[PDB]
Design a protein around this nucleic acid. Structure first.
Ligand SMILES: Nc1ncnc2c1ncn2[C@@H]1O[C@H](COP(=O)(O)OP(=O)(O)NP(=O)(O)O)[C@@H](O)[C@H]1O
Ligand SMILES: [Mg+2]
Lengths: 489, 407, 244, 81, 82
DNA sequence: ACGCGCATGGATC
DNA sequence: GATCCATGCGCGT
């Protein structure tokens, strides 16, 4: 009676007369498997233009999305077209932006044009405080030595944990439970001052270190360890201390990385005046400029600064939601916010390779891949090859938008994930031109080749007319403008 | 596990004799079983003295840097403090070792190292000390008097270990004094009875429950391998000493225990890295020998590829749901005891709640639909589009940050 | 430099689990009395010697299997030294039954199972002439190594269901049966398939029912889970654990 | 094994010359052979000194540490003893 | 530079890699790594920056697939190997 | 004589 | 190739 129910197990006793399906029946195939309020249409079928293909928008986004295809096939326009329909996806009764929260890791400056009323955060103006780290990345950033550094490791956490307690301006009940992984503000220059002081330790016959500051001599214990954070202290002892002359290279490696201005966005002087509240309003766009679309420009920064930038934000957005559940778990209300993270070209920071320089960024996107479905932090993976992303992350996506793929291994990767009943739709993958794609997963009724709706406001990723630009004059490229920006980059 | 605890004979009402202990790391079974003892980080009081010597060198110590002098004074303090606090026969007293699991005061161990950090000796090069009773030689008979803090060394020249343990002591004060190890190093862990620990784990205390959730979500990663191994050893030797009294008592009074290890590849990895060797050995101990003693595994893992070949082979019943990773399918199909027709493409095409069960407890390898859970592990799947569809709500960032702050 | 080593050993000597190998009775026992114990030549003669290794820890399980297998083999090796000197008609032939032979003899040159590997493989390669033969009974043939499984000549293939197990067996079987790929998983209870030198042709046989069957004392988990929550049993467990 | 025991040469009465060793883990062959000898952990007495060098290493030494200094004194202590 | 002036990339550059098996092969040894990723970056993200590649090679099965997948235009001469 | 500071060196990662 | 630690030797207060 006009309602379509999936399943080919229904038997038709022969002979049954056959007509071509009507228009509304073709609508009914891709529509009634989704409830009326969960339809999120952003594409049409390739075979029939006048039918729309809606997906279960509740199921489209909470389960992770993986968009793959060859270069120039139309991934970035489709990623943008999903988000433009997500922002416009408002309920009736209000004029203003809706509750969409999308974070884009943009590495080619494309989504600025696609979203004009959006907040854009390049590295030079982004401030990510170093004291927001949970100890695990406090170790891998500052420590360049990995194995036999137990005294150097110990003095690193003891300085930070003690300095986090000092800058506490509230009740002493939650002063105590401050730890090395607890995200409280500490001053990095005082921490170097402590370690440089501990490199100049001096002890008496009793083996207890005594110091001397502008108020008087004091014994180094738990309560008086806070007085080594200032430079104007002198050691008063007969013998060299336990760490005397053992932290010289440690301070050298620690200082050379604070003054490293690639890490000026994290270890700069702007991290002193930026608080915990301002950082979360920056990455989610809850600040003065409230926007659904958040874009971070990590376009032409080197890998190492890009690797810390991806690994910090992915965990800190997860650990926002990891602690956004237990407030709701202890209060039982419905006022959560869902966050979707767009990972354009995830091969650059979450590949299949097991190198140690790809380690800290893989786990941050791994942890969103499995446990991120629990805390409203979902991921959208864009990549050129499905077989280059790690299977621990990329197989966790239950929604697939596959563009043209010509690589045999890439074709084989789509193939074995799919069953053999509807596995013949993979044979049209290399014949896919610009625009159309295959959507499969739990969010759609049947996997089908569909034509993605054209972006009326497209990203700035226009294809270069190579021949038409070659028929012109030998143009005089202003080499001074390119070089002096290359050198500043 | 819901139908295990609801399965009773027609003679009573209340709780049955099912005993299930769940190693829950993703925090999923508090809502699944509301009539159970969920043991969190603050709830658990796990004694540090029930560890063997391998976990004690993983809880306090680190990698060796030709620091055998610092390691020896640590072991000689604990293996002596275990003797002093032992209140049994002298015959058992001599067999006490570092790996032996009796009580020792960790704060007294610090004071032994603190005294040994400043020791002084005479020309005869003998560590002479001073106490309230009198002046005494440092020897094995009188080394138990160094556990007190108010001891002053007396000697002409500095001792052998004088000033050689200053960097040893402060690492230790970063451990018992660390607040992320409160369960295994707190003051409650000092005063907890050995009987009180076991009745907490199997829920035999004041509040008795068939199912005990061991919430290890907040347990730190570098310590999680110690605690999984310690509890698994404690449960196994509970079942080992079950059968030792069963031969003498010759009566049918058994306590069968089933342990559920979720994300079991994490505590039992196929990699030979030294991080997860303690928890692998304890799980393998129950996998190989726990069948005789009434302690049974339930390996539940979403990624069965890193489960070790030896431990996963001891399983005799297999409940295979949908597996999307091909590495998981080649792992499962090779160690699967039976097979069904067209099984290579069947594993991705299994539906939601559909399982394939085979083993020696079911004669026909059958494809089954697991009956829907009426008391679910709460469906953690946030409705997304309609929650995006509403107005831009003002998220209360202050209470989110302040809970993040205390962690 | 040797306190952890001195501490590691003392934990093994005073271990009550390793009493059967490191107790005071192992010190006072003699080399002769061990071999009377192993093949039942002591005060009570028996054709079957059952080595209940259920209580043996799995770390030392490969050690004790290797120790016994080596002791049986060179019992048969030095048995031939008398027979070439005295030329006596009598002989002492020994057959060893390795239930779950896949774990004693895996397909790995790992240190943790190397000792029990070479003891079985020495018997499978040399023990034919010394009167020490082995019987392999494993539910997983495909983890038994090829260099020991192929030294067997008589093969009793029962119902085998894992496709990795069928392909390992079919390669090393000395002869084949028509539709062996479908015949092996379709064998009923007690249905076997024997090939080799002892039998004439590979025939599907029916093993005779055991009048006195091998039964294991298995804990009926569901049966005790129906009963009352036991209360007096828990306090008896800890007090013996405390006392021992 | 039951058939290999109960057959005799008919010229005698008593035990035959069969010699069988079973390595059972499931503890099941007592009910098959009631008149046999069982050697569980309580009654079996295996000498540690009958182990060779490789079995003595696995019984005591650890492979994961693999410290060269631990092994050498163990050879000097045992071979001298 | 042109994006600040709201223009497209002015000069396009084509890099012809003749016999790329000598420096960008299928094999994954460390000595071929630093010349591999140099041509991966042109193959992956070089389309929008005006830097494209021309891969000349003696066999399709010795060049790394990741560079070789992004080459949408394929020219094939006589190939005797099946 | 005891102490402190400077070496040379060892082990382990 | 670090770190971390031990051991030895020569010297001043
Ligand atoms: N739905 C569409 N209809 C028509 N043209 C489209 C569509 N989607 C993309 N295109 C065209 O695709 C080109 C840009 O491709 P793009 O969206 O950047 O895909 P891409 O895979 O992200 N490129 P890359 O980053 O190198 O992988 C332009 O020429 C667009 O006109
Ligand atoms: Mg793109």
């Amino acid at each position: 009676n006009g309602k379509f129910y999936r399943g080919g197990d229904s038997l038709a006793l022969p002979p049954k007369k056959v007509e071509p399906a009507k228009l509304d029946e073709i609508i009914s195939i891709y529509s009634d498997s989704i409830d009326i309020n969960d339809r999120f249409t952003f594409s049409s079928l390739s075979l029939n233009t006048k039918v729309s293909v809606p997906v279960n928008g509740n199921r489209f986004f909470n389960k992770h999305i993986a968009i793959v295809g060859s270069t120039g096939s139309g991934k970035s326009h489709t990623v943008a077209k999903i988000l433009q329909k997500a922002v416009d996806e408002k309920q009736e009764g209000y004029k203003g932006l809706n509750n969409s929260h999308i974070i884009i890791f943009d590495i080619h400056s494309e989504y600025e044009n696609a979203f004009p009323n959006s907040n854009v955060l390049n590295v030079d103006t982004l401030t990510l405080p170093y004291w927001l780290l949970n100890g695990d990345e406090l170790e891998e950033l500052f420590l360049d030595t990995e194995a036999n550094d137990h005294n150097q490791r110990n003095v690193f956490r003891q300085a930070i944990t003690l300095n986090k307690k000092i800058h506490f301006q509230g009740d002493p009940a939650t002063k105590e439970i401050i730890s090395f992984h607890s995200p409280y503000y500490f001053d990095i220059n005082e921490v170097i001052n402590y370690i440089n002081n501990r490199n100049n330790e001096r002890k008496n016959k009793d083996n207890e270190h005594i110091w001397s500051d502008e108020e008087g001599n004091f014994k180094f214990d738990n309560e008086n360890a806070h007085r080594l954070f200032k430079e104007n202290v002198t050691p008063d002892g007969s013998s060299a201390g336990a760490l005397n002359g053992k932290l010289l290279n440690f301070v050298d490696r620690l200082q050379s990385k604070i003054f490293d201005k690639r890490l000026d966005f994290i270890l700069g002087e702007g991290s002193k005046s930026v608080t915990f509240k301002e950082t979360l309003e920056t990455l989610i766009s809850y600040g003065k400029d409230k926007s659904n679309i958040t874009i971070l420009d990590v376009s032409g920064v080197p890998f190492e600064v890009l690797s810390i930038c991806v690994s910090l934000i992915s965990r800190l957005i997860f650990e926002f939601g990891y602690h956004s559940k237990k407030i709701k778990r202890k209060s039982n209300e419905n006022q959560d916010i869902p966050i979707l993270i767009v990972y354009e070209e995830a091969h650059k920071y979450a590949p299949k390779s097991d190198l140690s320089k790809y380690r800290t960024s893989k786990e941050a996107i791994e942890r969103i891949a499995k446990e991120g479905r629990k805390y409203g932090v979902t991921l959208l993976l864009a990549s050129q090859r499905p077989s280059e992303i790690s299977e621990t992350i990329f197989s966790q996506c239950n929604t697939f938008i596959s563009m043209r793929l010509t690589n045999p291994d890439d074709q084989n990767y789509v193939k074995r994930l799919l069953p053999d009943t509807v596995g013949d739709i993979t044979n049209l993958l290399p014949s896919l031109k610009e625009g159309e794609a295959l959507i499969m997963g739990d969010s759609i009724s049947i996997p089908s080749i569909v034509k993605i709706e054209k972006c009326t406001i497209p990203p700035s990723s226009i294809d270069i007319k190579y021949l038409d630009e070659w028929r012109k004059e030998w143009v005089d490229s202003e080499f001074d403008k390119i070089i002096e920006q290359w050198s500043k980059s």
